[PDB]
Each structure stands twice: as C-alpha cells, then as structure tokens.
Amino acid sequence: SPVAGQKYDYILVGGGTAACVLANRLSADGSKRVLVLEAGPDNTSRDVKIPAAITRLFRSPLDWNLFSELQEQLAERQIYMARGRLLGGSSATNATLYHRGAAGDYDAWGVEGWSSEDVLSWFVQAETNADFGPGAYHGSGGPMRVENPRYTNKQLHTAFFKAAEEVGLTPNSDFNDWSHDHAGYGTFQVMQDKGTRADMYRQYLKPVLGRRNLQVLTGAAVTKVNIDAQALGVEFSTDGPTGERLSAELAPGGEVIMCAGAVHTPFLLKHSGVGPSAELKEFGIPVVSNLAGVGQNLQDQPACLTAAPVKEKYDGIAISDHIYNEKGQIRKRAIASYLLGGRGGLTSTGCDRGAFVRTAGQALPDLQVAFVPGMALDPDGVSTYVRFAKFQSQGLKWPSGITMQLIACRPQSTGSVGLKSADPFAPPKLSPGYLTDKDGADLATLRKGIHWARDVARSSALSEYLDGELFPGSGVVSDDQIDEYIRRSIHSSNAITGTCKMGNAGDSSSVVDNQLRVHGVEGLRVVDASVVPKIPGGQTGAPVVMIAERAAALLTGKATI
Ligand SMILES: Cc1cc2nc3c(=O)[nH]c(=O)nc-3n(C[C@H](O)[C@H](O)[C@H](O)COP(=O)(O)OP(=O)(O)OC[C@H]3O[C@@H](n4cnc5c(N)ncnc54)[C@H](O)[C@@H]3O)c2cc1C
Ligand SMILES: CCCCCCCCCCCCCCCCCC(=O)O
Ligand SMILES: CCCCCCCCCCCCCCCCCC(=O)O
C-alpha cells in the first residue's frame, strides 16, 4: 500500500544506528531509491533527547523488553538485554559513551581489508569533536557530535581521579588516541550536542528526510527477506502481528541490507531460511542457506558493581542530589541549567568517567571501570536506572553515594540468538553466555574488578567521602562469595556484536565476507554490530557507525576494501 508498485535499489531492514548512516550515504546522489523499514515509532520522545532520561528508556515502550533464556551459570536467572526500538535504534537509547577501543582490536579481527590502518580514517570521517582538534585520530567535519560531558561533579569526579592515581593508575587523556596505550583513568567523551543526545537519527537520517528518493516507514515490522538464491526484497506488517503482511520489491541490481542489529538480524535471517538447518527444520522453515555462524559468536560485555554511601557531612553532593530534591521532584535548578545552558545533571548518562585496566598483564585491558557519582540501590546497574526513573515524585530522598561498574570489555565468553517459535513477532531465543569461557577468565576479570574498586574506595582520596560499602557489602569477603555476588547481580553493559560475523574466504564460522555479503545469497548484506568478528574494548556504537560509513563508501563506489 505505501510500497505499492515501487521498486527499490536498497531496502534497509531496521532504521537503527547503521541504517540511519546508510539511508544518508546511499540516498545522497539521488540516483538510488532507498526504503527504510523500522518496527519502532518515529524518534520524537523527550526521553530520547535528554541524556539522564535514559533511566526512563529501559523497560519502556521504546525498548524491545528482551529477556534471555534461564542462565544456569547465573543463579538460574533470565537476563534483561535492553535494545532500542525506534528510528535511531540503540543510538537513541544508549549511554552515549564514545569509544573505539585500541588498534590491536581491529588487527585481532584478522579479516583482509579491515586492519587498524584500514578503519582509522572512517572513524575520523564520521566525527565532529568539540574537545579534540582535527588530526589522524579526530575529525571536525563528520555528522556525529562528540564532546566532553557537560556535567562535572567537582567533588566526586576529582575524588575518583585522585583515587585511581593513588592505587597506581596512569591518566589517559584520550581513550580513542591509538598512539596512547588503552589503559589509564580519565573522561569518556559522549555522543551529545551541547548535552542533547546526538543519536544517528538526529545526526544522519533526520537532516535528509525531505529527499524524494528516500522512503522511511515506522511501525513497519519486517517478518522475513523474500528470496528466490537471490533476495527479492522483504515482507512486513504496518500494524504488528494482527496487521496485513505487505511485500517490498528490489529493482534490478537492488540489495536488501540487514540493519536489525546483533539480536534481530540473525532472528530475521533464520525466519528467512538463512542459518543452521537443524534450528530452521525445528519450526518447519525452508533452508535457503545453511550457515553455522548465524546467531553464534554473540559477544557482550558483562558488568557487576560496587556502591558506597558518602559520609553524612557530604549529603547533597551526588548527581542524584543534582537531579532530584528530597521528595523525588526534578530540581528546577537542573531543568534550568539543562534548557538554558545544556549543563548540569540532565546532560549526564551517569557512567562517563572511568578507566581501562589490565587485571593480569593482558596484551590489552580486560577491565573497563565506569564511575558514577550516584549510589546504586540494586546490584544490577540497569535495574537501578529503571528504579531511578520510577523514583520520581515518590516523596523519597535518594541517598548520596557512588557506584563503580566493572565491565569485562574484551570478554572470552560467547552466547547465541535463535528461534523459540515460527512466529516472527515472537521474542528471539536469547542466550548471552556470560561466564561460560572454559578458563573462567571473564569471572576472573570481574572478581579482580571488585578487588580493584574496593582498593580505589579504601584509597585516602575516596575514604574522605565514603562511609562503608553497600554492594557487594561487608558480608562478601572471600573470592567464592565475590563470584557468587557476580552470578546473582551480573547484567549487560549493552554491547552485543558478532552474531553475523564477517570472515575471510574458507571460514565456515563466518556469515558475511569482507564486503558484508551474506554467504550463498545474492544481493543480501548485513551492516550492523552483527558483522564485528571480535568485539573491541569499550562501548560498540562508534565502531557500528565506522562500519556503516565504510559499507556506504563501498556500495556507492567511493572506496574498496
Ligand atoms: C541501553 C544501551 C546502552 C548502550 N550504551 C552504549 C554507549 O554508551 N556507547 C556506545 O557506543 N554504545 C552503547 N550501546 C551499544 C550501541 O547503542 C549499539 O551497539 C549500536 O547502537 C548498534 O547499532 P545497530 O544498528 O547494529 O543496532 P540498532 O541501533 O539496535 O538497530 C536495530 C534496529 O532494528 C529495528 N528492528 C528490529 N527488528 C526489526 C524488524 N523485524 N523490523 C524492523 N525493524 C526492526 C530495531 O527496532 C532497531 O531500531 C548501548 C546499547 C544499549 C541498548
Ligand atoms: C530522571 C530523568 C530526567 C528526565 C528529564 C525530565 C525533564 C522535565 C522537563 C519537562 C519540560 C521541559 C522540557 C524541556 C526539553 C524537552 C526536550 C527538548 O526539547 O530537549
Ligand atoms: C543518571 C544517574 C543515575 C544514578 C544511579 C546510579 C547507579 C549506577 C549504576 C551503574 C551504571 C549503569 C549504566 C547503564 C547504561 C549502559 C552503559 C554502559 O555500561 O555501557
């Protein structure tokens, strides 16, 4: 009906991070007709624009509300795995932390055309940085907005940096400068524009919407890719399960580009008969291409946390004191600094200072620390954000304190995504696989992370401010007690890469080639976090945008690869 008698040179499945970038580059010269299909709504919520309102996006109608299969190894728990559901995708709902990891992470892919020397200039092309001048590591011209966070907690941010130095860490002035070693303490830059979320809808898609060759449908859930093997286009509903199934057709030479993210791309490819035959057979799905790797190599960065209250003399100095009054009302001072100056607590996603640490002489840091100048009231950091949102207007005072989140940033465990039913509107079968690596390296990383965070809090610099420890608490002393606390509290830092991994020729574990072309289908590609062979250290948004920029340069003939 909206797609009736139309032919497309590109159909983008999903309108998320990578999709927004491609919708921009692919529709640029005007020759090519581009369709974007997004299950979620338009990007208009105020909870998207204001960074601190990330607290409200968790477990909201703008999230997929995904829960994992029971995890035997995690105290028999289902794990929440947040994913954005709207134009912009997870760039619209994330913590805005701007990280690339280290050159070593790209060299460790071992995929021809995709070394550190190859990807660098693509990071730079994407970026306008407010706080680093232009050079080999920073752009001044690209659609992304990157800045130093516009909120500083003068007492607790200073205390954390002094504490990190006190325990023997060196400062890193730029976690994204590949001439520096990745390890050290300092500030995480954010994907913000003077304290407004700079998601890839705002930066890439929204400025080019008036282009006549670009069509974008929202509330448009893709149920499968129509394949003949050669991609014909895709099927979708414009009213969810109980809505008419339409179909969208490629023009001659046209391609379907999968941009439904490391969770939904493999789910859709499987419902499209691409992935392991046995999984397909289980639900009477015809096998079009039998690929081992579809839904495999799920890499996510797991987290735990410590948290401590401030001494009574420091009541009122926390970010929670800057955002909420003693009755849980948003402070009129916070709203004013935000709207008049793009300053203050509402510009914060909380977790934008920290460190990369080697717990045991690894080639690259295994541990990322995110310091928060506010106290966790749930050992699950993501649950704490949900409760912080739900706390508003409850007539209660959030206690002043700090959190350190510990993230296994180069993890050795892998998980999977597959099918629980034949209904393409059914939640996928999600297994994060945290703490399954055979050497128990990921648990070792987080356990040593807890020891590190306790040394930092017991430092003279943080001892000044802190009064005891709430999580894990003085009950948790031995390494076995620490590991048990981790099993019970472990949560996502919300990466998720690797589920349609790219590989060299003659790697049967791979799903796409170095050109992002799906093995044994013609005119079908994947351009999202699915393709990352081995997850880099740090949050995964900037690497997705770098892959999208390079994919678009490839598709429009401006570069090889
Ligand atoms: C809560 C959270 C916090 C994060 N924090 C950070 C951080 O601070 N910094 C950072 O760099 N990274 C962060 N990340 C990760 C980062 O946001 C993602 O890695 C990146 O945005 C992935 O982009 P993508 O295009 O691969 O997927 P997405 O951006 O998730 O795009 C997938 C899109 O496909 C849509 N879709 C799914 N199924 C269908 C269907 N059937 N039909 C149509 N559309 C469909 C989804 O609704 C979504 O809009 C965070 C992630 C989350 C979820
Ligand atoms: C706890 C999470 C904080 C949520 C922030 C709520 C802010 C309340 C202000 C409501 C009215 C003023 C709106 C000002 C700006 C709204 C969006 C924008 O245009 O940037
Ligand atoms: C915004 C103010 C929050 C106050 C509550 C403090 C509790 C801290 C919990 C730990 C941080 C959770 C981060 C969730 C966002 C995901 C980002 C990431 O870790 O990559």
Side-chain angles (χ1 to χ4, degrees):
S1 181
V3 85
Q6 307 271 271
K7 294 198 132 222
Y8 298 101
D9 309 283
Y10 295 108
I11 311 188
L12 307 188
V13 175
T17 310
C20 285
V21 173
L22 289 177
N24 178 305
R25 305 310 190 185
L26 296 178
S27 70
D29 69 18
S31 49
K32 253 82 169 210
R33 288 288 311 284
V34 190
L35 187 63
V36 176
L37 303 163
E38 170 59 44
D42 198 11
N43 185 322
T44 68
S45 174
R46 182 182 305 131
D47 293 342
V48 169
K49 304 180 154 62
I50 307 164
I54 188 181
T55 55
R56 292 177 173 178
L57 299 180
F58 287 123
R59 298 288 281 122
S60 80
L62 294 173
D63 191 71
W64 276 101
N65 293 92
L66 299 176
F67 283 84
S68 71
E69 296 303 293
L70 273 145
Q71 301 291 108
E72 185 272 333
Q73 86 284 11
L74 307 185
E76 323 257 40
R77 282 176 322 107
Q78 292 186 271
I79 308 298
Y80 176 50
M81 306 193 80
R83 286 291 100 172
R85 194 179 178 277
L86 72 159
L87 285 181
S90 292
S91 73
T93 70
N94 69 20
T96 72
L97 307 187
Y98 181 78
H99 284 290
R100 306 182 189 161
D105 295 315
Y106 302 85
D107 302 330
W109 285 7
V111 177
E112 181 52 29
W114 288 96
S115 84
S116 47
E117 283 195 292
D118 292 320
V119 296
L120 180 49
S121 67
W122 296 96
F123 277 121
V124 165
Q125 200 209 238
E127 180 189 26
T128 295
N129 203 291
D131 291 299
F132 291 102
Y137 311 107
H138 290 290
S140 56
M144 298 183 78
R145 295 294 182 270
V146 180
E147 60 183 17
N148 292 353
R150 284 163 72 96
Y151 169 76
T152 303
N153 192 302
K154 315 206 164 62
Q155 275 164 301
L156 293 175
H157 280 137
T158 303
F160 169 71
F161 293 148
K162 289 293 175 198
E165 199 176 7
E166 191 160 351
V167 304
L169 258 71
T170 60
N172 187 339
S173 64
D174 186 6
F175 296 109
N176 296 137
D177 182 332
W178 288 353
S179 78
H180 307 166
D181 180 66
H182 202 41
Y185 63 89
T187 300
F188 306 149
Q189 293 207 288
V190 292
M191 288 170 294
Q192 297 185 21
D193 184 358
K194 301 203 151 77
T196 295
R197 183 181 293 278
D199 66 51
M200 301 313 111
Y201 170 82
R202 191 175 176 277
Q203 298 317 121
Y204 283 88
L205 181 62
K206 184 192 156 103
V208 303
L209 281 176
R211 284 181 181 168
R212 263 187 313 98
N213 53 321
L214 175 59
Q215 190 177 176
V216 177
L217 308 177
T218 65
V222 174
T223 50
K224 61 169 289 176
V225 179
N226 294 321
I227 303 170
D228 180 283
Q230 152 77 256
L232 297 191
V234 308
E235 177 178 296
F236 58 97
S237 171
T238 72
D239 208 342
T242 75
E244 178 161 340
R245 304 294 189 74
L246 297 63
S247 171
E249 289 180 47
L250 300 179
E255 317 204 42
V256 171
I257 320 272
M258 297 306 287
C259 308
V263 164
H264 280 114
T265 282
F267 175 84
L268 291 175
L269 279 189
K270 285 177 189 187
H271 278 268
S272 292
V274 187
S277 57
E279 295 183 40
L280 294 181
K281 286 157 151 55
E282 180 180 358
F283 296 103
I285 294 157
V287 176
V288 184
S289 177
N290 176 26
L291 289 164
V294 179
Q296 294 291 114
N297 187 56
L298 197 151
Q299 295 197 287
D300 187 31
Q301 295 160 348
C304 54
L305 64 78
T306 75
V310 294
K311 296 176 194 164
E312 296 141 4
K313 73 193 274 206
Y314 292 120
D315 274 348
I317 69 162
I319 193 183
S320 57
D321 299 300
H322 300 151
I323 295 171
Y324 286 143
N325 72 9
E326 82 280 347
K327 294 173 164 283
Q329 303 290 13
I330 310 282
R331 286 207 198 256
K332 286 184 268 167
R333 166 175 320 289
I335 293 163
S337 298
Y338 184 65
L339 292 179
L340 292 171
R343 295 287 175 188
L346 298 180
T347 67
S348 193
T349 61
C351 55
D352 51 15
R353 278 71 168 187
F356 287 94
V357 176
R358 294 177 174 85
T359 59
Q362 302 83 342
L364 289 176
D366 54 313
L367 179 72
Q368 182 185 24
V369 182
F371 175 83
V372 185
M375 193 168 72
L377 286 184
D378 187 320
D380 181 329
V382 175
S383 309
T384 289
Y385 272 49
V386 172
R387 296 165 193 285
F388 189 84
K390 288 192 182 151
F391 198 78
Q392 184 178 351
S393 305
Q394 298 302 308
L396 293 163
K397 165 73 158 78
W398 192 282
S400 304
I402 71 95
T403 310
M404 279 173 279
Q405 197 187 44
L406 307 146
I407 306 165
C409 54
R410 284 177 179 97
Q412 283 184 43
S413 304
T414 56
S416 65
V417 221
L419 304 193
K420 225 162 41 176
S421 88
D423 184 355
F425 293 91
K429 198 176 64 163
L430 205 38
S431 183
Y434 300 148
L435 273 23
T436 61
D437 71 284
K438 70 165 199 306
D439 281 332
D442 288 354
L443 180 56
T445 294
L446 291 186
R447 176 201 312 124
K448 294 202 179 100
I450 297 252
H451 283 305
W452 191 90
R454 282 170 156 180
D455 297 331
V456 163
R458 186 189 327 121
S459 81
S460 77
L462 272 170
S463 299
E464 174 53 26
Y465 287 96
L466 297 189
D467 200 27
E469 170 189 282
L470 170 58
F471 298 124
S474 64
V476 175
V477 183
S478 90
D479 285 354
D480 291 354
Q481 283 170 332
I482 292 169
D483 298 348
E484 194 52 30
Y485 169 80
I486 294 166
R487 290 190 175 99
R488 292 188 285 90
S489 63
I490 190 165
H491 51 278
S492 186
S493 85
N494 302 311
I496 321 184
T497 73
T499 52
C500 304
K501 102 168 162 191
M502 83 175 176
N504 297 144
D507 178 348
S508 47
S509 78
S510 94
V511 176
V512 303
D513 52 5
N514 77 347
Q515 310 284 304
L516 306 179
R517 290 178 300 197
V518 177
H519 291 319
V521 190
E522 270 300 345
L524 185 62
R525 302 210 209 204
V526 181
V527 189
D528 66 24
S530 312
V531 315
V532 172
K534 191 172 167 61
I535 191 174
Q539 290 61 38
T540 52
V544 167
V545 171
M546 176 277 293
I547 289 159
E549 286 279 23
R550 209 190 179 197
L554 178 76
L555 291 179
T556 67
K558 301 215 163 167
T560 61
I561 327 199

